[PDB]
Design a protein around this ligand. Structure first.
Ligand SMILES: N=C1CCCN1Cc1[nH]c(=O)[nH]c(=O)c1Cl
Ligand SMILES: N=C1CCCN1Cc1[nH]c(=O)[nH]c(=O)c1Cl
Ligand SMILES: N=C1CCCN1Cc1[nH]c(=O)[nH]c(=O)c1Cl
Ligand SMILES: N=C1CCCN1Cc1[nH]c(=O)[nH]c(=O)c1Cl
Ligand SMILES: N=C1CCCN1Cc1[nH]c(=O)[nH]c(=O)c1Cl
Lengths: 347, 348, 348, 347, 347
């Protein structure tokens, strides 16, 4: 007996869809779902998706409320759809995937991931749910996460962090670090050695290494001396140059975090979605320096330092490919006279 | 077991809400309800009401599909709400009443009309439904229809016609003539003697008496001579006067029907609802004669002739009250030198 | 060169998308596309689909404007998608298929039907378009139409009529009768022997055989006597029975057409889409007889007579399967004492 | 001469409806009201209600701008409608009541509360307005507030705080503490002895007693010792247990306030309205501990301590009824071996 | 080849319209523009204007991304339309002007400002763009800004600050101080001597003079003594009186800034647009003092002091006209017994 009113009953009484029996009266208007509480309408859901309001409400109510991979990792691994769950994209306020399997009669393409319509799609499987490892083994295309080993399968250790109800966190009361596995055309695929981004944000930025503490604490000249970074344009690249009309550099989140603590600036997130590299239109409030496309990545500073120090500085211009979050990120490296001028990731 | 998806399943499978178990997939968008059929979306309902789309859909699916009184009758009798049904108002594409009793959880004020919230409201009861005559007997305020006698209650014979799925008709395979009863503050009321409007339409107009046949077939002059109508301004009032820029008269539907057969015109229904008197902005296409507010009533011609021949004609202008469809309709009567100049109903 | 403004320029200047260069100014508001003509806004398209307004506009502009199979045929043959065209579904005012191939960047799953995403889907190919017969020969799943012979493939002769810009017609200046071919999992299929529905409408109903002429012109009794139809309940099944509150029979479009000429009625099309069997909520205006779900099919009368005269009549009720428009339509047959009581299609 | 344009004139020139004469040009679009200022459109009102945009605009413009009872108190006392004013619900951005009396021609069921249509409804009367005490005396059902005594009527002293333009506050320049009176079916009703919630919020939380200062300042072991709370599971109940997957306890707002100062967490207010007990879907950012339905109440800590210490701890499971904000709040008390395990309010 | 899809291509790849060739797939729904990124819809623009969604999107994408005059200055100078650019109004989230010249085929009234349809309109010209000074000279009505002298034209030195992507700032990496020129009916007009407002906001308020530092730092009695302000009701006017039901005074932004640091209050901006004088409905959270129409201006405190000390205090009531932001601001001055009672600007 699945229905709009039963989904709303579950949201009101359980905080999300929990399979309970019951109904509440519902009103739909203004792309919004209301329920009646003691004679007046209370908003339960405002649709920000491109789906019909009542369909989006049901997928949101049926969202996975356990730690799940961040959407950027699923996208980077080519995931098209999830087995018997909904990965909600809190950056977009919308389902991460267009279709479902065994979730919702308006969006399901199948009830089980073994149906043949699913074979060409990369299905996400969650080894914490009974039966899903076996489904991964039978699927032609898929991505599997587990908490532990799967007999005979070679794992890839994922990022330390995961998303729990739209909060990205490294779990202490719950496990957020998974093994990853991937199959293409029926064949298990070796996932590449990879760096991971750290998923921090500008204002709550906390360092995760002694080098990152030093960078936030020392003066730039002091930090550069200790970590032997002369000639790598580290200031320009990480900390930014605000002296000209066009803002120079500023491509690591920790550098924006330091600048923001000192002096606020505006960041227009003009493609608002989860991605390994983010592009912002930045305007510095104190100087008026700005840049329409400022590419930013949150790598652990030690990782970025390892990457840039590995580069040959003998060419004026060069694409540098780095595996990050399982995907190939192209960096542009600009050099002159054997030292770096700039280095930035591309989206 | 109440559910949007179950309402849609009933619409798809039974043509209306029939209390069947089942569900179909539904999308709501654009103030429209869709359902998915073989991979594509099919429209089931477009909301034209001021209620939320899913609520309006459910009240529409739960509409009464038996012959029921036209909305103008229920309005004139002061009905506020219906016992355990929805009277769908097809002139407004909306429920006839704001609230419900035992129909829909978003709009219900009660499950049964015996709840005290219902005592002040004038509840419509339907003697065809078991138990509702007795519910009327116990109610403080109500209107009751029946198909036959009720012990101890004198009936008022209602109109011949009723509304069945939005079609107004005089039933032959089904009964459409009801007895009417009304209670106010626990007291059974004597309903007044009344004329009834005939609820016909311009394009499909059927005469219902020999006088109406003669009016449609004879020339104006011969008709007036036959029924001895000199001095009552029938040429103005019923036939209409298209000779000046302001259209004169034309206040009886049969007169519009006769003109429309001969020469088409535009009628703008600028207050689109069911009422005993209708006002139209009329533009005649042949002549260009027009009138912003042309008040029109569909009386049997014989009834209209009885009314106008039953008036005193000795003052320039006055209000004439006529009980029609159970309500008091004001007409304006204008006379000169002992004869009619014009006579028209007012929408009020 | 793809662009909303370029799509609008083609609509304004060519009547549909024709691949021409140019642009006009466009406004989108109210799920409606406008363009500016001499300082004011003119409506080009009102979106009635569940797709975004600008996407629906483009698919509509890119609709196939040649005669194409009616949507019910394509549905019954299991077509999922069309190769490099849009079949516009004029009954739903929406694309017949959710996705496209080589039409529109928002809806395309592929540029060409040879991409592997297309292999499981049943792709509609059009032999009038160069290369598409060969694309069918190579496709895993498909339906092909042609105007003539294909070397090595046995044809199924399709219906006489097809849809041209939403008008269903039997072409005289253009060919509307196609050969049909179908492949499932790489294997060419033998399509079954089938009847076809005639796709006529109530108001414009044209007889297509002498038997149908006789049915429209003769009285019920003389018709039944002439074609020796006693015992098959044609009076109930085809002519309909309006004598009780529940309307009896009336399951053949020609019978509705004959009634409609004599006396109008209301048909509520409560699942508005193209299908072989249609269900209507019918209310007869003259009698008040009505039925919530009246199943109606437009067969040539001769075909219907062949079907009903080809059944065993010895049990109270059973399901009779009939191949119509390439699909298996279930009918319910009800008999008593060796004669028909009623016979009606089911929408399923 | 009441009209949409006159309501907008009043909003522009007086900040709200003030009965002044005048008109401004208005545009309605996107469920929003605009007025034209020097050639361009300026937003005056965005409709978040289920009423028609122009109707909601007029009720919002006609909102009571004096301190009024919080909506949760009116709801708890059964109020259906207000006499000749609009109580605006700033938690819902909507009128607290569906219908009006003498306010708005689209929503009025009557012009005066003495009309018989009002008799079955509990009408709110404001004794600060001339004539309303007398109307309360003539009404069959109603709730009256006053600043002072009403001859012969037995008062109930209300909460110290009230709402002024959506700000909940204890007045110093204005009076916010009212006497309350209530009638049902023509009969004055004795209002119960009651606790009141304190209406504080998470981030601006300020303590209102020495015990509350101590709780924010001392360590939990120290606080528990001083106030002799051993065996009442006070830590679990008030301060929360974040060590497991499912978040244990945490049912008093002061405990969330303390936790939030230390380490931020997300609170999804999935039924957004004013109520004595609130239910949140909480996710702790530092540990990943979470709970779909966490029931929370803001009682003065001294009040909560009085309540829990009053309980008999000899039964494993027991509903405990406490009058709060004039309504019966059911608490679940769970005990083992003569000490409390948990204690939480229900919504 | 201008089109909706090309505008969206530019927004995605360049951060704004940059004249680049290319297209992305776009969806329009819910008065919102989406583009498809790897199979799912991402929001690019939410229309808050009264224009059609796709038209508003194009004007926003084509917004001037250099420092431009704040909208209040353009409005005060009578500007109706801009030459070959879009001044975006970030206070209204909408174009500052209804029509355009050479920007957008749905809103253009002309392609060049020399067309005769433009003659009756005051056109904004930007002397930093090649050719626009000459266009100003040929225009019948217009306003011109430049960075430097224009031969033979008498300049007016504008405000120090300008708006860069909705951030108001005094430029250090870019120039924000312009010369202003204005023509009416073909004749160059002498712009008046004027004060300028400072365009600061409540929470980030930073002082810009020793007097402003003193006001934030000293006690009111101390500040008043040092700057010899006795008898000018400075406390009432600047700092506010919260002791009564109706909030007295509080008309300078610096006074609200000081009060807000000490104790928060609500400011309802009920006409949300950019203007020299702003009107707020204010409610003090600590006392409950409030005022429906509180007129506020951000003048440098030294400027306000110069203005009030210049006034003759011998009349109970008097309108005082002050040129601010090039416009005539009327102040009401109320005096008794030779000292000020209050002084407030009018909107
Ligand atoms: N600074 C400029 C001006 C245009 C090119 N560019 C470099 C740059 N920087 C980024 O941050 N991201 C890019 O993609 C690119 Cl590309
Ligand atoms: N013809 C005119 C011009 C204005 C008055 N009038 C009569 C009239 N005729 C109607 O039909 N209805 C009215 O209400 C009225 Cl009133
Ligand atoms: N007349 C009635 C009343 C309910 C059953 N029935 C027969 C019928 N007739 C149709 O036309 N179509 C049906 O599906 C069915 Cl079923
Ligand atoms: N902790 C759990 C898991 C399910 C039951 N429960 C207790 C609880 N806690 C609340 O905070 N509120 C409740 O209503 C209830 Cl019930
Ligand atoms: N304090 C009051 C009560 C009504 C008049 N007034 C003064 C005032 N103060 C402002 O701040 N702005 C005004 O426009 C005006 Cl006017």
């Amino acid at each position: 007996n699945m229905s709009l009113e039963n989904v709303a009953f579950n949201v009101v009484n359980k905080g999300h869809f929990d399979g309970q029996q019951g109904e509440v009266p519902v009103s739909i208007i203004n792309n919004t779902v209301y329920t009646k509480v003691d004679g007046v309408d209370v908003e339960l859901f405002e649709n920000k998706t491109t789906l019909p309001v009542n369909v989006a409400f049901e997928l949101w109510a049926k969202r996975n409320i356990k730690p799940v991979p961040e959407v950027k990792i699923l996208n980077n691994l080519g995931v098209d759809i999830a087995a018997n769950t909904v990965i909600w994209d809190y950056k977009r306020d919308a389902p991460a995937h267009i279709s479902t399997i065994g979730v919702c009669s308006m969006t399901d393409i199948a009830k089980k991931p073994t149906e043949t319509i699913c074979a060409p799609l990369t299905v996400f499987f969650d080894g914490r749910v009974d039966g899903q490892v076996d489904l991964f083994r039978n699927a032609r295309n898929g991505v599997l996460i587990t908490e532990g080993s799967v007999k005979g399968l070679q794992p890839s250790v994922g990022p330390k962090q995961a998303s729990l109800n739209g909060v990205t966190l490294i779990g202490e009361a719950v496990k957020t670090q998974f093994n990853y596995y991937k199959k293409v055309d029926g064949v298990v695929q070796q996932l590449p050695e990879t760096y991971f981004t750290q998923s921090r944000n500008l204002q709550e930025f906390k360092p995760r290494s002694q080098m990152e503490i030093d960078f936030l604490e020392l003066a730039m000249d002091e930090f550069i001396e200790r970590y032997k970074l002369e000639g790598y344009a580290f200031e320009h690249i990480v900390y930014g140059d605000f002296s000209h009309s066009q803002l120079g550099g500023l491509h690591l989140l920790i550098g924006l975090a330091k600048r923001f603590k000192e002096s606020p600036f505006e960041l227009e997130d003009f493609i608002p979605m989860d991605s390994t590299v983010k592009n912002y239109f930045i305007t510095d409030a104190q100087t008026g320096s700005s840049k329409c496309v400022c590419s930013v990545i949150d790598l652990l500073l030690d990782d970025f330092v390892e990457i840039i120090k590995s580069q040959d500085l003998s060419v004026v211009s060069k694409v540098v490919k780095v595996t990050i979050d399982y995907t190939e990120i192209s960096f542009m490296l600009w050099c002159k006279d054997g030292h770096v001028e700039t280095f930035y990731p591309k989206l």
